[PDB]
Design a protein around this motif. Structure first.
Motif, PDB file in Angstrom:
ATOM      1  N   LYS A 103     -35.838  -0.256 -18.390  1.00 32.39           N
ATOM      2  CA  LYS A 103     -36.524  -1.594 -17.813  1.00 32.39           C
ATOM      3  C   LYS A 103     -37.124  -2.123 -18.942  1.00 32.39           C
ATOM      4  O   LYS A 103     -37.793  -1.374 -19.829  1.00 32.39           O
ATOM      5  CB  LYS A 103     -37.334  -0.901 -16.874  1.00 32.39           C
ATOM      6  N   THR A 104     -37.041  -3.364 -19.144  1.00 34.05           N
ATOM      7  CA  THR A 104     -37.857  -4.393 -20.354  1.00 34.05           C
ATOM      8  C   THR A 104     -38.811  -5.068 -19.310  1.00 34.05           C
ATOM      9  O   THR A 104     -38.168  -5.855 -18.544  1.00 34.05           O
ATOM     10  CB  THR A 104     -36.640  -4.946 -21.037  1.00 34.05           C
ATOM     11  N   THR A 105     -39.913  -5.228 -19.980  1.00 31.37           N
ATOM     12  CA  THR A 105     -40.812  -6.166 -19.274  1.00 31.37           C
ATOM     13  C   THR A 105     -41.505  -7.063 -20.514  1.00 31.37           C
ATOM     14  O   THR A 105     -41.646  -6.518 -21.587  1.00 31.37           O
ATOM     15  CB  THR A 105     -42.148  -5.374 -18.828  1.00 31.37           C
ATOM     16  N   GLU A 119     -28.554  -1.436 -23.759  1.00 26.68           N
ATOM     17  CA  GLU A 119     -29.785  -1.626 -24.705  1.00 26.68           C
ATOM     18  C   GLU A 119     -30.450  -2.772 -24.547  1.00 26.68           C
ATOM     19  O   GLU A 119     -30.123  -3.653 -23.842  1.00 26.68           O
ATOM     20  CB  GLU A 119     -29.488  -1.360 -26.087  1.00 26.68           C
ATOM     21  N   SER A 120     -31.826  -2.788 -25.375  1.00 25.28           N
ATOM     22  CA  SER A 120     -32.470  -4.174 -25.310  1.00 25.28           C
ATOM     23  C   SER A 120     -32.978  -4.295 -26.852  1.00 25.28           C
ATOM     24  O   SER A 120     -33.286  -3.058 -27.235  1.00 25.28           O
ATOM     25  CB  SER A 120     -33.610  -3.923 -24.147  1.00 25.28           C
ATOM     26  N   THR A 121     -32.669  -5.259 -27.263  1.00 30.51           N
ATOM     27  CA  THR A 121     -33.176  -5.470 -28.609  1.00 30.51           C
ATOM     28  C   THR A 121     -33.984  -6.468 -28.686  1.00 30.51           C
ATOM     29  O   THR A 121     -34.289  -7.643 -28.055  1.00 30.51           O
ATOM     30  CB  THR A 121     -31.944  -5.718 -29.535  1.00 30.51           C
ATOM     31  N   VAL A 122     -35.149  -6.382 -29.991  1.00 34.03           N
ATOM     32  CA  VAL A 122     -35.749  -7.579 -30.383  1.00 34.03           C
ATOM     33  C   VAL A 122     -35.934  -7.828 -31.778  1.00 34.03           C
ATOM     34  O   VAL A 122     -35.450  -7.178 -32.584  1.00 34.03           O
ATOM     35  CB  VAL A 122     -37.426  -7.185 -29.979  1.00 34.03           C
ATOM     36  N   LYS A 123     -35.706  -9.168 -32.051  1.00 29.43           N
ATOM     37  CA  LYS A 123     -35.780  -9.705 -33.389  1.00 29.43           C
ATOM     38  C   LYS A 123     -36.829 -10.857 -33.453  1.00 29.43           C
ATOM     39  O   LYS A 123     -37.457 -11.447 -32.431  1.00 29.43           O
ATOM     40  CB  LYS A 123     -34.384 -10.435 -33.819  1.00 29.43           C
ATOM     41  N   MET A 150     -33.812  -0.512 -28.200  1.00 30.57           N
ATOM     42  CA  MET A 150     -34.063   0.476 -27.284  1.00 30.57           C
ATOM     43  C   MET A 150     -32.934   0.814 -26.571  1.00 30.57           C
ATOM     44  O   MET A 150     -32.369  -0.303 -26.006  1.00 30.57           O
ATOM     45  CB  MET A 150     -35.224   0.363 -26.469  1.00 30.57           C
ATOM     46  N   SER A 151     -32.340   2.000 -26.412  1.00 29.06           N
ATOM     47  CA  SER A 151     -30.994   2.199 -25.918  1.00 29.06           C
ATOM     48  C   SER A 151     -31.295   3.306 -24.643  1.00 29.06           C
ATOM     49  O   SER A 151     -31.963   4.163 -24.481  1.00 29.06           O
ATOM     50  CB  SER A 151     -30.225   3.005 -26.932  1.00 29.06           C
ATOM     51  N   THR A 152     -30.268   2.866 -23.759  1.00 28.05           N
ATOM     52  CA  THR A 152     -30.129   4.080 -22.878  1.00 28.05           C
ATOM     53  C   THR A 152     -29.192   5.296 -23.241  1.00 28.05           C
ATOM     54  O   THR A 152     -28.543   4.977 -24.294  1.00 28.05           O
ATOM     55  CB  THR A 152     -29.339   3.499 -21.483  1.00 28.05           C
ATOM     56  N   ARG A 231     -42.420  -4.400 -22.976  1.00 22.62           N
ATOM     57  CA  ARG A 231     -42.670  -2.959 -22.644  1.00 22.62           C
ATOM     58  C   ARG A 231     -41.358  -2.400 -22.313  1.00 22.62           C
ATOM     59  O   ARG A 231     -40.301  -2.941 -21.533  1.00 22.62           O
ATOM     60  CB  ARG A 231     -43.734  -3.113 -21.233  1.00 22.62           C
ATOM     61  N   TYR A 232     -41.061  -1.125 -22.767  1.00 19.18           N
ATOM     62  CA  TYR A 232     -39.888  -0.239 -22.429  1.00 19.18           C
ATOM     63  C   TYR A 232     -40.208   1.054 -21.828  1.00 19.18           C
ATOM     64  O   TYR A 232     -41.234   1.683 -22.095  1.00 19.18           O
ATOM     65  CB  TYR A 232     -39.278  -0.064 -23.827  1.00 19.18           C
ATOM     66  N   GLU A 233     -39.527   1.129 -20.599  1.00 18.32           N
ATOM     67  CA  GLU A 233     -39.550   2.556 -19.991  1.00 18.32           C
ATOM     68  C   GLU A 233     -38.286   2.968 -19.256  1.00 18.32           C
ATOM     69  O   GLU A 233     -37.554   2.018 -18.969  1.00 18.32           O
ATOM     70  CB  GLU A 233     -40.653   2.389 -19.019  1.00 18.32           C
TER      71      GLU A 233
END
Lengths: 259, 258, 257, 262
Positions: A103-105, A119-123, A150-152, A231-233
């Motif tokens: 989950k990405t918030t 995954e979710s990436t930020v740049k 952030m990866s599963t 936010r990552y969880e």
């Protein structure tokens, strides 16, 4: 059971889809893409991912199956064995197994939420990318570099692997944070190592100066202006596969990367 | 409850021990180091490792408490909070451990070891070459300095120095890591750290040389006529007496980022 | 030219040597293994290394050539089946000398000095070492060990430790870490470090003075060591080369294909 | 000597500039922007990089010196408080010119670029795939995020973040690093950073997409329909006015390890 089929869009997939539908018609098996019990994805890991995002609200609920053709990590079936799969699904010898999701918030100055399979990436949007990394409300590091990922657990074979991440068996309940090109000096000291967080832990990226970011969840990149926090969880939601035998994960990893 | 206290051997550790022991005199807690209920370790992670191994037959009976004469990763107590610890002396929280099985080609039985941190394998001299077998299927032929299988709680130590991921110690896993692999025409390894769930078995099989330096935590024994080294998440767990939630990531920050 | 040949001792290499010796008898060239001008190595980098270490007091005066059967690797440019061309080309003197840098190691307690062709390593056997660069404290390392590589040695152990592969003409040495703990108390740089000539790297024990020091080849247990000192040697190894040495294609042929 | 001064543009640096220009008026020192012989940069490696690039058509006739107005980085050997002491020494000419190697990038669709730090190649948005040709011979097929070619002095910057070796800036070389390469028995790459001498050319050749984000130091441009990107050590060098030995490894220590007095 209620079922539906997505295809990549090319000739082969579309033909397979019509043939399988024809084969299910002989059985007590109804096509239904509004509330399906089984989803069958034909083509590859891109069309699978699209099917997953098509049904985020009904994941509870759905058992996914993949077909395609180097199987990769979201398929255990080839086109020359589809008829065998119709029969086995048919009635009904499987085998439900679940993988963790991410989950990405994104908060601004209305909160946005996203589910990732990989995954979710930020740049950075603009210049430098600088972010405070806060774990469970406590400051961990001030990161400067290209970005974070952030990866599963299922995602660990993809982008995560390129960045120096651990390859994780997809059953493990976790998410994994890797650095992209950290400066790691005495001003911006970072851990270096990939980090693996259990369920209920939250990782928070807090901007230090520039508040614009490119966020990409699985496929889709979005520019987010004036971000206060990311936010990552580990998600409460899981993805379910219909398994007809034990998925030989480490063998797939061998076949993909070794050779 | 029955208890014992181990110490690093230095000045401060022995003083704090005699202090706590005099502190347990006022209550119904008898000293016993044969079958104790609480093991208290004073002196840091090396000391704590020794106490764990001192009582690895009674792990289901014992709660461990670490005091670091400082903290580390296995102590949440400083040697001035000791007084408030005696008074309190809880929830019993479990960490996962690593089973190592060494099987031999001679008329000698398998030897089994439990690790809190890691087990490592290196050669006894010449080149180290080993077949890696996961759930009975050949995964890779590894050439290099050696290999390291870590527990989740072991990931902050040697595993970290080798490129391993740090894992919260609650996660049921073991992580395999490479020491200076070779990758060329002939040898191809995965490169990445590998994290296995419970019930998976990673088996190391010799190709040419049956002699290995196998380390389990502190202890490294030279093993001969080895036919297989097997790794899996143990059914056994270590129990910590927790008086407060352990701030693991804060402790990573303090050790590594501060 | 005075010359000598070393083979590794298997028949194939032994009999190529004999037939090269006879081929050279037809020219003005004299077999001399005490003061050769040309050292020829037949059979592999192990044999070439031993030859280099046999003749290190006359590296000044010697040009090396390697012959090898498989993938030629980095210290040979000839296969057996070409041996007859080499005999002729050498004898007509149709070559250019080309040099690689070397690594000097000094071990202090009394003082021992060593030349390396490839690398020099330090391991303990609790390995804590102060790393001092040009007489200034750089880091306090705790871990498995340290590796100082020559340019040519960068394809070996240096490579497995995360080091850069360097063309062997660059006058440098490269320091790599093995499993640095790299915490608050023992901060290290992480990256490989590439030093030019005249720079000096000094490793100084903080607690235990015993170390396993290796120099290519030979691992020696040095007792009560106060210092290990690294610098680019004033000495170089010279090759007799009959064409441009294709270094990057050998990297490909070893690591990629 | 003819000189000029670039500032980061904060008050601190802008005022130091005017203090020094005034100080230099006590000497025979002529302010000139078009043809300077000494370029003084005030305010960090970023400011130094811009100055370099302002005068890259006249590098052989200029000696560069830097004042870093926060700490100091890798291009500035002077603190703002030492400005007046620097005014004198420059007016005497008691300095050795020390040169550092540069990287030349050629892009063919030919445009050429000098870098003091690095040049990088990334894709527009699609997968990044390129054939890597060294000295006219195919070396590997790279798939990944990107590639970075660094100068020696640029090894302490992006190169370092990517797992590159730190090299003393005197060494005549360029260093190639991988950004997030895919290794999967289809796209096998070397992994290791590569260090090339002078006269070696590394050639990046497109496969199935000819559009690349190319960067040169600070500057980043989208090149379309590229056939080739070529890297080599330039014949041109940058010259620093040195008044004392540059302690490079100590600056690496201060930046990356610790700095217990500052």
């Amino acid at each position: 059971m209620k079922y539906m089929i997505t295809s990549k869009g090319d000739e082969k997939s579309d033909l397979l889809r019509l043939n399988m539908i024809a084969g299910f018609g002989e059985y007590d098996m109804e096509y239904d893409d509004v509330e399906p019990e089984i989803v069958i994805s034909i083509g590859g890991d891109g069309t699978f991912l699209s099917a997953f995002h098509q049904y985020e609200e009904r994941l509870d609920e759905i058992a996914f199956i993949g077909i395609h053709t180097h199987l990769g990590f979201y398929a255990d079936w080839r086109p020359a064995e589809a008829d065998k799969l119709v029969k086995l699904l048919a009635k009904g010898e499987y085998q439900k197994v679940s993988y963790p999701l991410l989950k990405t918030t994104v908060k601004y100055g209305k909160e946005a939420t996203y589910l990732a399979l990989n995954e979710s990436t930020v740049k950075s949007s603009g210049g430098p990318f600088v972010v405070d990394v806060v774990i469970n409300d406590i400051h961990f590091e001030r990161f400067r570099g290209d970005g974070l990922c952030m990866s599963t657990p299922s995602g660990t074979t993809a982008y995560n692997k390129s960045l120096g991440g651990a390859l994780m068996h997809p059953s493990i309940e976790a998410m994994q944070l890797t650095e992209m090109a950290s400066i790691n000096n005495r001003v911006y000291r970072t851990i270096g190592s990939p980090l693996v967080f259990p369920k209920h832990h939250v990782v928070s990226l807090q901007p230090v100066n520039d508040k614009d970011f490119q966020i990409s969840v699985d496929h889709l990149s979005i520019l987010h202006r004036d971000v206060q926090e990311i936010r990552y969880e580990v998600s409460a939601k899981k993805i379910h596969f219909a398994r007809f035998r034990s998925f030989p994960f480490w063998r797939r990893v061998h076949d993909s990367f070794i050779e």
